Design a protein around this nucleic acid. Sequence first.
DNA 1: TCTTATAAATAGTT
DNA 2: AACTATTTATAAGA
Lengths: 17, 91, 90
Amino acid sequence: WGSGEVKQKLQEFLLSK
Amino acid sequence: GRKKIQIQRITDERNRQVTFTKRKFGLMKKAYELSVLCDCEIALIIFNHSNKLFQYASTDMDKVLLKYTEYNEPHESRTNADIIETLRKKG
Amino acid sequence: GRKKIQIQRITDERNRQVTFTKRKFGLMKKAYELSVLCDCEIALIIFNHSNKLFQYASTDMDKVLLKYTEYNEPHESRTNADIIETLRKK
DNA sequence: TCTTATAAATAGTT
DNA sequence: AACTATTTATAAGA
């Protein structure tokens, strides 16, 4: 888990709602 | 402190920065104590007016942020409005 | 308060729950005050030992979290170890 | 749960 | 920045 990879994962999850 | 203050935006640039630094540390210190006393995980994200980022995490930010994305169900959610209202009806 | 306490896990379950609820509000109240007094944006995420989720945001959580994902630049980062360190040295 | 004695945070002065 | 009188938060009794 990269720092940017969890942030980028956080980004998806937000925009997905 | 020496006096009670109103909870209002401090316009003096120097007092704002001094207070920001003081209370941000206080806030993190309380987050530290809360995580340890009660065995909880806590992440805190602060952007100051200059849009600079400050961050605290009991253990590790990315674990908490990961834990957050996988959270499906209803939770407790509070904002400044909820806090103010709760304080009003403390009287 | 009545007796000073050490910062270590409370073993009595019910005092732990009482302390969690009271100090959680304390923390959120201090966040509210910092957010208004210094006009900053704050988000707070808490998972208790039972993995139940508690959240606070000055304005809107999703708004703050999103901006976080766009900001990777060098910033301040703290953990309990850092705080414990600063307390030693103060 | 409520109160309160006491510890902890902090506003103002400097 | 330090300090400190005062406000605030809170541990423990109830």
